[PDB]
Design an enzyme around this catalytic site. Structure first.
Site, PDB file in Angstrom:
ATOM      1  N   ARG C  61       0.800  -1.233   0.000  1.00  0.00           N
ATOM      2  CA  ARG C  61       0.000   0.000   0.000  1.00  0.00           C
ATOM      3  C   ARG C  61       0.831   1.281   0.000  1.00  0.00           C
ATOM      4  O   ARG C  61       0.308   2.357  -0.303  1.00  0.00           O
ATOM      5  CB  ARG C  61      -0.899   0.056   1.218  1.00  0.00           C
ATOM      6  CG  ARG C  61      -1.839  -1.117   1.356  1.00  0.00           C
ATOM      7  CD  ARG C  61      -2.969  -0.804   2.324  1.00  0.00           C
ATOM      8  NE  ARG C  61      -2.505  -0.193   3.581  1.00  0.00           N
ATOM      9  CZ  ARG C  61      -2.458   1.117   3.850  1.00  0.00           C
ATOM     10  NH1 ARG C  61      -2.869   2.038   2.971  1.00  0.00           N
ATOM     11  NH2 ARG C  61      -1.990   1.518   5.030  1.00  0.00           N
ATOM     12  N   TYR C 114     -14.389  16.759 -15.194  1.00  0.00           N
ATOM     13  CA  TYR C 114     -15.003  15.445 -15.246  1.00  0.00           C
ATOM     14  C   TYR C 114     -15.997  15.376 -14.084  1.00  0.00           C
ATOM     15  O   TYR C 114     -15.756  15.956 -13.020  1.00  0.00           O
ATOM     16  CB  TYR C 114     -13.930  14.337 -15.181  1.00  0.00           C
ATOM     17  CG  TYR C 114     -14.476  12.969 -14.869  1.00  0.00           C
ATOM     18  CD1 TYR C 114     -15.349  12.330 -15.744  1.00  0.00           C
ATOM     19  CD2 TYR C 114     -14.140  12.319 -13.684  1.00  0.00           C
ATOM     20  CE1 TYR C 114     -15.875  11.086 -15.444  1.00  0.00           C
ATOM     21  CE2 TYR C 114     -14.654  11.068 -13.379  1.00  0.00           C
ATOM     22  CZ  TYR C 114     -15.520  10.455 -14.261  1.00  0.00           C
ATOM     23  OH  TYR C 114     -16.024   9.221 -13.938  1.00  0.00           O
ATOM     24  N   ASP C 186      -4.690  17.398 -15.129  1.00  0.00           N
ATOM     25  CA  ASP C 186      -5.204  16.069 -15.480  1.00  0.00           C
ATOM     26  C   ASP C 186      -4.916  15.841 -16.959  1.00  0.00           C
ATOM     27  O   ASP C 186      -5.574  16.430 -17.821  1.00  0.00           O
ATOM     28  CB  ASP C 186      -6.697  15.962 -15.179  1.00  0.00           C
ATOM     29  CG  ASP C 186      -7.269  14.574 -15.476  1.00  0.00           C
ATOM     30  OD1 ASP C 186      -6.764  13.867 -16.371  1.00  0.00           O
ATOM     31  OD2 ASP C 186      -8.247  14.182 -14.809  1.00  0.00           O
ATOM     32  N   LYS C 211      -7.878   4.757 -19.243  1.00  0.00           N
ATOM     33  CA  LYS C 211      -8.158   5.149 -20.616  1.00  0.00           C
ATOM     34  C   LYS C 211      -7.025   4.715 -21.583  1.00  0.00           C
ATOM     35  O   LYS C 211      -6.809   3.506 -21.789  1.00  0.00           O
ATOM     36  CB  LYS C 211      -8.414   6.660 -20.673  1.00  0.00           C
ATOM     37  CG  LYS C 211      -9.339   7.236 -19.618  1.00  0.00           C
ATOM     38  CD  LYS C 211     -10.674   6.555 -19.619  1.00  0.00           C
ATOM     39  CE  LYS C 211     -11.553   7.121 -18.544  1.00  0.00           C
ATOM     40  NZ  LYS C 211     -12.588   6.109 -18.150  1.00  0.00           N
TER      41      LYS C 211
HETATM   42  C1  LIG Z   1     -19.078   7.975 -15.225  1.00  0.00           C
HETATM   43  S1  LIG Z   1     -17.940   6.768 -15.885  1.00  0.00           S
HETATM   44  C2  LIG Z   1     -17.131   7.753 -17.051  1.00  0.00           C
HETATM   45  C3  LIG Z   1     -15.658   8.125 -16.801  1.00  0.00           C
HETATM   46  C4  LIG Z   1     -14.895   8.946 -17.646  1.00  0.00           C
HETATM   47  N1  LIG Z   1     -13.586   9.243 -17.343  1.00  0.00           N
HETATM   48  C5  LIG Z   1     -12.734   8.885 -16.162  1.00  0.00           C
HETATM   49  C6  LIG Z   1     -11.821  10.086 -15.849  1.00  0.00           C
HETATM   50  C7  LIG Z   1     -11.342  10.251 -14.538  1.00  0.00           C
HETATM   51  C8  LIG Z   1     -11.653   9.263 -13.406  1.00  0.00           C
HETATM   52  O1  LIG Z   1     -10.714   8.250 -13.651  1.00  0.00           O
HETATM   53  P1  LIG Z   1     -11.189   6.831 -13.158  1.00  0.00           P
HETATM   54  O2  LIG Z   1     -11.436   6.885 -11.707  1.00  0.00           O
HETATM   55  O3  LIG Z   1     -10.153   5.829 -13.412  1.00  0.00           O
HETATM   56  O4  LIG Z   1     -12.431   6.465 -13.884  1.00  0.00           O
HETATM   57  C9  LIG Z   1     -10.528  11.341 -14.232  1.00  0.00           C
HETATM   58  N2  LIG Z   1     -10.194  12.291 -15.204  1.00  0.00           N
HETATM   59  C10 LIG Z   1     -10.637  12.172 -16.465  1.00  0.00           C
HETATM   60  C11 LIG Z   1     -10.233  13.235 -17.491  1.00  0.00           C
HETATM   61  C12 LIG Z   1     -11.445  11.080 -16.789  1.00  0.00           C
HETATM   62  O5  LIG Z   1     -11.869  11.004 -18.073  1.00  0.00           O
HETATM   63  C13 LIG Z   1     -15.431   9.551 -18.943  1.00  0.00           C
HETATM   64  O6  LIG Z   1     -16.598   9.391 -19.377  1.00  0.00           O
HETATM   65  O7  LIG Z   1     -14.679  10.267 -19.642  1.00  0.00           O
HETATM   66  C1  LIG Z   2       1.851  -0.201   8.123  1.00  0.00           C
HETATM   67  S1  LIG Z   2       1.504  -1.667   7.167  1.00  0.00           S
HETATM   68  C2  LIG Z   2       0.838  -2.740   8.428  1.00  0.00           C
HETATM   69  C3  LIG Z   2      -0.674  -3.063   8.390  1.00  0.00           C
HETATM   70  C4  LIG Z   2      -1.365  -3.852   9.326  1.00  0.00           C
HETATM   71  N1  LIG Z   2      -2.720  -4.045   9.212  1.00  0.00           N
HETATM   72  C5  LIG Z   2      -3.691  -3.449   8.242  1.00  0.00           C
HETATM   73  C6  LIG Z   2      -5.073  -3.297   8.910  1.00  0.00           C
HETATM   74  C7  LIG Z   2      -6.020  -2.426   8.327  1.00  0.00           C
HETATM   75  C8  LIG Z   2      -5.761  -1.667   7.016  1.00  0.00           C
HETATM   76  O1  LIG Z   2      -5.891  -2.697   6.062  1.00  0.00           O
HETATM   77  P1  LIG Z   2      -5.051  -2.477   4.716  1.00  0.00           P
HETATM   78  O2  LIG Z   2      -5.293  -1.119   4.176  1.00  0.00           O
HETATM   79  O3  LIG Z   2      -5.521  -3.495   3.748  1.00  0.00           O
HETATM   80  O4  LIG Z   2      -3.614  -2.645   4.953  1.00  0.00           O
HETATM   81  C9  LIG Z   2      -7.271  -2.273   8.930  1.00  0.00           C
HETATM   82  N2  LIG Z   2      -7.592  -2.952  10.116  1.00  0.00           N
HETATM   83  C10 LIG Z   2      -6.711  -3.770  10.696  1.00  0.00           C
HETATM   84  C11 LIG Z   2      -7.101  -4.490  11.987  1.00  0.00           C
HETATM   85  C12 LIG Z   2      -5.462  -3.943  10.106  1.00  0.00           C
HETATM   86  O5  LIG Z   2      -4.617  -4.790  10.733  1.00  0.00           O
HETATM   87  C13 LIG Z   2      -0.701  -4.579  10.464  1.00  0.00           C
HETATM   88  O6  LIG Z   2       0.520  -4.520  10.705  1.00  0.00           O
HETATM   89  O7  LIG Z   2      -1.385  -5.281  11.231  1.00  0.00           O
END
Ligand SMILES: CSC/C=C(/NCc1c(COP(=O)(O)O)cnc(C)c1O)C(=O)O
Ligand SMILES: CSC/C=C(/NCc1c(COP(=O)(O)O)cnc(C)c1O)C(=O)O
Ligand SMILES: CSC/C=C(/NCc1c(COP(=O)(O)O)cnc(C)c1O)C(=O)O
Ligand SMILES: CSC/C=C(/NCc1c(COP(=O)(O)O)cnc(C)c1O)C(=O)O
Lengths: 392, 392, 398, 392
Positions: C61, C114, C186, C211
């Site tokens: 992450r 967007y 963007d 895209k």
């Molecule tokens: C209602 S579904 C239609 C989605 C469209 N586009 C996405 C998009 C995003 C967001 O990016 P994602 O989160 O990966 O989708 C960000 N910035 C731009 C310029 C984008 O075109 C679309 O119809 O053009």
């Molecule tokens: C600094 S990296 C160590 C991460 C650990 N855990 C994650 C975790 C999350 C968040 O979940 P993700 O976003 O999928 O990682 C939520 N809730 C609980 C009880 C969790 O243990 C860890 O060391 O125990």
């Protein structure tokens, strides 16, 4: 020597060799480069570590291979694109025209088809023997006999084979013993430790355990697997396992012990239930005391397994009504998935057949094979319950 | 009929059959269920549309197959675990002992191995012919000639066959023609449209285009593909393609036309470069006026392709040093990736032996093969230039 | 002639940059690190990974080697120091704006955004005390005039979604250098292959890698590219704490696969769209038509100045109104009725009867769109098949 | 109502709705098309139940969501790209400037970071309370209190909350109760049945089980989940789960029960061992009879879990020496993998801190956390044992 489950999770892999990665990276690549052509010459001659092309060898496949080798207790493993991939690759390298192969009395449909309608039509002689009958086998041995091949338990009667007994005979005459160990998995039966040379699997079944890959494994001696890899796989089948599927197979193997424990526990209850029912004629489950070969099954298999075969009073008709009545069991071929599968070869796999053709083979009119899954047993009981009531 | 790119992107798929999904979902499942046993009876009789088990057929694989069939102009396609999977599956079903098979003079090494040390050790006769010499081919034919198999262009010297001339002779004598069309792809050459019966691909190369899957395609008549599916794949090789890799292959195919255009434009510039350099003795590229079968190249391939083969004056020693010097080109067997690749079979795939083995098995001392990738042509030129200086 | 200090070409770097097969068993394609966590040799090689000194890994992450390669490669293509890979485009945008903005800061915005970005700003981050203001970014005098001391970020698309309005990115960065704001652009529509806001003075770019970068419509992914300091901040706050918009290494591997053919795919998108836009303008049925490659396009000279090619997006209005557009769309057999872009498949939308179907005729202008409007994402199909489909579809709108 | 194992394998899916496919197809697709504009009119409204974009609603994700909902006894589910995805999406939707959130006394590191250094810095009030102390909870409630958020058992000391008591106090003031149920899973503890409104999961842990994805789940009331879908996920995080990872997650969920049974049994043993050692100052495991909140633990948790926290007498230094001597446990953060994991926060996640800033925060000098894996208990005992000997 660390335990079965430890090895199924850890064997052949240090995280510290791959940037600390806890799960091994997936080598989803077809080819590998060389530092030099001299290095690249040595990889085709076959005298170094490393790689060149994924059809031959690949680190993700290599880890799976070694780990499976460890579970079965063998020296080497080979990964292939299906069970048939494993069987055909193996048999194509060990047999040439005028060699003979001794087979179990009953085999998996496509293994039978491969032997009789495939390799058997290329001048390899075929012969079926009862592998529980050591007397009948020892007679049938000739100097031409190169391979002995069978399943234990066998599809679909659960017919066992005296692996140790068979292997001692084969050792004297120079024959190579190959066991399809699909139904048990190394967790339940390790034929190599009873003298077998090779074990093949359909990893599609219990090893994967989640019905989402098709895959095959061969395990046995370094010498035998090296040959099968460099001839059967490389030249004669091309049955190359995807590294992605190889990685999913390794994912499944990590819960093999737990998955089989439950398969076997559910299977036991349903078998014992089925025994005490007026609809049923007989049952082939290795862990019922009434099972013909109970003694041998327990000398080889640590647990009775997840597969129940049984026949019904009413035959063909009682099967169709039973199968169609099932609301939780799925009507499908295959086994060893988390989902509980049922099949009735009489009116499914071998349905275009008529009753007059079926009796030729060891395959009954009323026979319905279950693959007992991981679901809550009480729900599985209730489904079988209503299905037997519907088969009147 | 829509254009190549339209079909390579759309053929055989409508989103409205799969919840409107633009990209078809991946059927990563080994087995399929039936609503009743009488439904499942017909799927094994082959008399009702549907699925049962992914080794025989799968919807993701079927799409790939049908799409590939359109691109090659063929009736049906089959997807397999590898190119060798395609070849072995095909020939295992088409030949039985006593059949003669005429091979082209040079073949890709594992195909050569499979023929001579695999299927040809089970009583299948082999003869080698120059498929460019139509007189000799005609003269070579017998009634027992069941199969004519070749690559055009051939590994590794780029040697060509008049596909239509060969097919004419095959229609006369009654023989099946099988062309390995890996190098060209359906985009540049379509052997079925010039009278071939079957075409085989290593989909690992150009069709995939990105070095990540191992795969094979067979395309031909429904009658022949059905036999290859139901016997070669099912019983004899088990070389089943992962739905994951099948889906990646289809992703690759969506840019086939664009990728091949660039491979060919880059290769042309690099060929004309190589012909002008003092270190280079001979060059085989189909787009060079000096190519011996230049007329046939333009008559049969729509573009001259991405592969170059050439020889350095200083023999095996200069090849080693040329190969060792490359910084952008990678030392590797295989072709058709975005990444430019090179190999010098003389000190890689075919190394240990002295010049005398390398003569009769026609691969020169100094022969270097290049798969020209999609990198900026100036970068590739610069890498080849310094590698030539370093070759001396 | 010339030596090692020459930059490799765009296609070379899109295939090779940041990866030598010799550092990974010789694997030609980089292994996919489909692993959530990483381990430490000693307990102190974990200590330094969290704090200060160490180069290495702990959790996917924050950082993953498959994602790192994607990142470093996208950085090369954009001409930035550093990259970040996220679960979606909105992942890239929110993760960025959540770390750059706090209550009291103002964000200057492009006149059109967007939909989900607009929503994020007005109904998401704007409701947590971040102040909002829209300015026509093509008007450099108006932009100068709207700068306050609280203006922390100038954010905008160019070309914008969906009217393809453009801004002078160099002009914006010059205004921002003087006042002190961070410019975020963007760059989804152009991709680094057509336009490179970082090389024109922008501080960060964000993409919906869903895209053209992906190119094959099978993943959802985002990218941020910019200075090491700003990207590190975004990684360590925006993604770590505030979105958790982690990209699957599987999908990161596919995005890298898509990037290997970006130049080729964009070339063909743009060639198709140009031929289609020129065809469309000469037809009886069409009122207006916006496409940067036509001289009629309002910002033709700015389009040419900033974009190396005019892109794959077309907009036009029909004669006959909604009833004609309604019939036009339904008549399409090759184009799909869908909302997205940068797919190999050509996509059309008729917002009158689709995305704004629940709205009424007059409400369109003061939310902000027309009555026979049709947005097109031109795909990679043979141009003749795309002409034939649009031709017969126009005939059915008649 | 089918059993937990049955629902974790089947809930929300019939093979017949997808060509009979046993395993559901993976919808690796960004966009969905429409058959007409009239069909696509209502997918930006709600009255037509199709799909439009995978960030909002994808078929594979919905199956995962419906299934996770079933297991948790909630109305509806949401799939997200990480546990933090689910947490942040939930909290951004439910909280605004001026609102107060009541927190459990100790939280997972990045949750604490999100609250104090993320959303807290946008005018949202934070207050920590002991969630077992209902008197202190009621006293902490204000009108501004909109959300109550905690883990149970919590990092690090396995400190339980009284979920049924908390929900009763929340019902008086109208507030919403969000429970991080990562450690337990729906198999061991179902906070919705004890009165909570939403549960969140790092599906990265036990739910996946195999350490190869990052995924988050939210389960709760339809109205609440709908909002977190359309506000938190759509606009404010964009933490979209890959359909590939969502397919793996569901694969992992089919062995949840079996894996949790084994995790808990290995933990039970290894805590019984650890509690009787000279090197161990103090141990926190729910299943030990001397656990402070033992009675309350068993009211909520059907089994005591796979996590153990314990303190070594030699302080920070003994922790270091113990960690480093482990050969089978890996040194890593994260938990719920098949592979056993250990971290010693005092020389890993919190080493930049000084001796006195750890107690302030709520972490000890010698505190070692163990995620007890699925390995053979005897191997795990051996490894811990020798590591304890080397700690002195
Ligand atoms: C209602 S579904 C239609 C989605 C469209 N586009 C996405 C998009 C995003 C967001 O990016 P994602 O989160 O990966 O989708 C960000 N910035 C731009 C310029 C984008 O075109 C679309 O119809 O053009
Ligand atoms: C600094 S990296 C160590 C991460 C650990 N855990 C994650 C975790 C999350 C968040 O979940 P993700 O976003 O999928 O990682 C939520 N809730 C609980 C009880 C969790 O243990 C860890 O060391 O125990
Ligand atoms: C006609 S489709 C039904 C297939 C079934 N089984 C397969 C199988 C194989 C072959 O393994 P693959 O090649 O992976 O399928 C090998 N060995 C054994 C004991 C097997 O059970 C079946 O219905 O039980
Ligand atoms: C010794 S490793 C070198 C392999 C090479 N090629 C493969 C190939 C195949 C076999 O296809 P797969 O099974 O997919 O590999 C079939 N047909 C052709 C024309 C091929 O080029 C090579 O070096 O060119």
């Amino acid at each position: 020597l660390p335990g079965f489950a430890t090895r199924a999770i850890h064997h052949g892999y240090d995280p510290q060799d791959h940037g600390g990665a806890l799960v091994p990276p997936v080598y989803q690549t077809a080819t590998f480069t060389f530092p030099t052509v001299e290095y690249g010459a040595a990889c085709f001659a076959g005298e170094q570590a490393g790689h060149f092309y994924s059809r031959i060898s690949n680190p993700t496949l290599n880890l799976l291979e070694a780990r499976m080798a460890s579970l079965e207790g063998g020296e080497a493993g080979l990964a292939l694109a299906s069970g048939m991939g494993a069987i055909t690759s193996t048999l194509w390298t060990l047999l040439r025209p005028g060699d003979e192969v001794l087979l179990g009395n009953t085999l998996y449909g496509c293994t039978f088809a491969f032997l009789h309608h495939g390799i058997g039509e290329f001048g390899v002689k075929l012969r079926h023997v009862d592998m529980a009958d050591l007397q009948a086998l020892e007679a049938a041995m000739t100097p031409a006999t190169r391979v002995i091949y069978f399943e234990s338990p066998a599809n679909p009667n659960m017919h066992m084979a005296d692996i140790a007994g068979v292997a001692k005979i084969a050792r004297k005459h120079g024959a190579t013993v190959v066991v399809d160990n699909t139904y048990c998995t190394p967790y339940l039966q390790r034929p190599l430790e009873l003298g077998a040379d090779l074990v093949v699997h359909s990893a599609t079944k219990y090893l994967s355990g989640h019905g989402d890959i098709t895959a095959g494994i061969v395990v046995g001696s370094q010498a035998l697997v090296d040959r099968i890899r460099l001839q059967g796989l490389k030249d004669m089948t091309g049955a190359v396992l995807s590294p992605h599927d190889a990685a999913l197979l390794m994912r499944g193997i990590k819960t093999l012990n737990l998955r089989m424990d439950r398969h076997c526990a559910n299977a036991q209850v349903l078998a014992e239930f089925l025994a005490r029912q007026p609809q049923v004629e007989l049952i082939h489950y290795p862990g019922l005391a009434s099972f013909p070969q109970y003694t041998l099954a327990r000398q080889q298999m640590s647990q009775p397994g997840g597969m129940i075969a049984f026949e019904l009073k009413g035959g063909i008709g009682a099967g169709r009504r039973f199968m169609n009545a099932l609301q939780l069991f799925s009507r499908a071929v295959s086994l060893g998935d988390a989902e509980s599968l049922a099949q009735h070869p009489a009116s499914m796999t071998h349905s275009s057949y008529t009753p007059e053709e079926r009796a030729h083979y060891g395959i009954s009119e009323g026979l319905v094979r279950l693959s007992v899954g991981l679901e809550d047993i009480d729900d599985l009981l209730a489904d079988v319950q209503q299905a037997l009531k519907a088969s009147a």
